[PDB]
C-alpha cells in the first residue's frame, strides 16, 4: 500500500513538469533548494514536511534613480571567496 498511499489523498499537485504527489504546495516564495522543473522547487520545512513552491528569484529592490541623485560608498569591506 506504499505506492497507493503516495498516489491518493489531497497531497497531489499538477505541474508542467508532471504530477507531484506527497509534497504540499505553498504560496510562500523561497530560494530553489531542489529543482523540480518549470520554476517549481521542493525543500524540507516546518511539523516538518516536504513543501513545493515557486522559486524566488531574489529580493526585489526598487533603485531610487533620478536625474540628479548619486550614491557614494562611505566605507569598505575586504572579503575572501573560495573558488575550485
Amino acid at each position: 500500500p506504499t505506492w497507493r498511499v503516495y498516489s491518493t489523498g489531497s497531497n497531489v499537485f499538477q505541474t508542467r513538469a508532471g504530477c507531484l504527489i506527497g509534497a504540499e504546495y505553498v504560496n510562500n516564495s523561497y530560494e530553489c533548494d531542489i529543482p523540480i522543473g518549470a520554476g517549481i522547487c521542493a525543500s524540507y520545512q516546518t511539523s516538518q514536511s516536504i513543501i513545493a513552491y515557486t522559486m524566488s528569484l531574489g529580493a526585489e529592490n526598487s533603485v531610487a534613480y533620478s536625474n540628479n541623485s548619486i550614491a557614494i560608498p562611505t566605507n569598505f569591506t575586504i572579503s575572501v571567496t573560495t573558488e575550485i
Partner: peptide
C-alpha cells in the same frame, strides 16, 4: 583552490 581577495564597498549615502 584560489583564494581571491576582493574589495567590496559598503555604507552608501545619498547625495
Amino acid at each position: 583552490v584560489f583564494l581571491h581577495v576582493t574589495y567590496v564597498p559598503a555604507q552608501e549615502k545619498n547625495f
